[PDB]
Amino acid sequence: ARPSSSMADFRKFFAKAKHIVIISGAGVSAESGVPTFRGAGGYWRKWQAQDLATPLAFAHNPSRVWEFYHYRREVMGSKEPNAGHRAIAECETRLGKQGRRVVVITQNIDELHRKAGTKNLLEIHGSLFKTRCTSCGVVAENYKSPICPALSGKGAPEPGTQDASIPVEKLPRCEEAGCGGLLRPHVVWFGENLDPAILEEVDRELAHCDLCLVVGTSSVVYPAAMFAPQVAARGVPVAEFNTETTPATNRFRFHFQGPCGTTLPEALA
């Protein structure tokens, strides 16, 4: 039960596909210089990213979690879309002129698909550059560097860096009149459900698609890891683009090895 590595055969499906869903994970941004969760980039100070991206973490030490998110926002400041992001964006524009739909369902919070020009984007895990008020619930875009003055020069990643220990009053706060609630990043933490509206949107896309790509993702985090398998179970061809095999590889019709910045321009031409 094993995937094909034939691009020519994938291209035969691609030529006819009317409704393509492209699922991405951190590997799509690796060639932009954005750290992944797997490997060495997935550590900040002595923690793993899945240690800090939790409601318990935030409740216990919101300064520490904000220092972590600050660091990621600042990392992003210099980063640009790569050839894989661009191929995806250009594909959507080209096919759209022909009446054919391409939609990107990303786990990423890095906004690089946006910067590349993707329009049909579902950020299923939220965005590094939005806030949500824990008091009022308002969602706001926020690209400020630093997001608050007390985080200026904070966030360094090296193990043994002292906690900034910023009092909650000096962490990012809501600016709505009379609120002043503590902000959090408008991201999905481990242990938190996705937004129901997002689940519904995904469900509609997967049920309607006739071709699916699964790009740069380890296929370990749920529910997102369920998505491409479900499409394959329907009998729809799924093509995995990854520098390695994953637990999901053998569920799919195709496996294209190598950096997606190389393979996606070729696939989506």
**Checking DSSP bridges between strand 139-141 and strand 126-133, what pairing results, if any?**
antiparallel
Please indicate if the annotation marks 218 as binding a ligand.
Answer: yes
| Edge-to-edge order in the sheet of strand 126-133 | 139-141, 126-133, 183-187
Tokens of 105: 């369902």
Element (H, E) at 239: strand 238-242
Q: Which of 70, 85, 125, 186 is catalytic?
A: 125
Distance CA(138)–CA(174), nearest Å, equals: 9
Please indicate if the annotation marks 69 as binding a ligand.
Answer: yes
Please indicate if the annotation marks 203 as binding a ligand.
Answer: no
- Reference 20, options 222, 178, 241, 194; nearest CA is 241
Q: Which residues bind Zn ion (CB under 5 A)?
A: 133, 135-136, 174, 176, 179, 181
* 85 labelled catalytic: no
Give the nearest distance from C-beta 190 to Zn ion in angstroms.
24
Question: Are 23 and 105 a contacting pair, CB within 8 Å?
Answer: yes
Give the nearest distance from C-beta 177 to Zn ion in angstroms.
10
Please indicate if the annotation marks 245 as binding a ligand.
Answer: no
Give the nearest distance from C-beta 207 to Zn ion in angstroms.
37
Q: Which is nearer to Zn ion, 141 or 176 (CB)?
A: 176
Residue numbers in the known binding site for Zn(2+) are 133, 136, 174, 179
- Residues classed as catalytic: 125
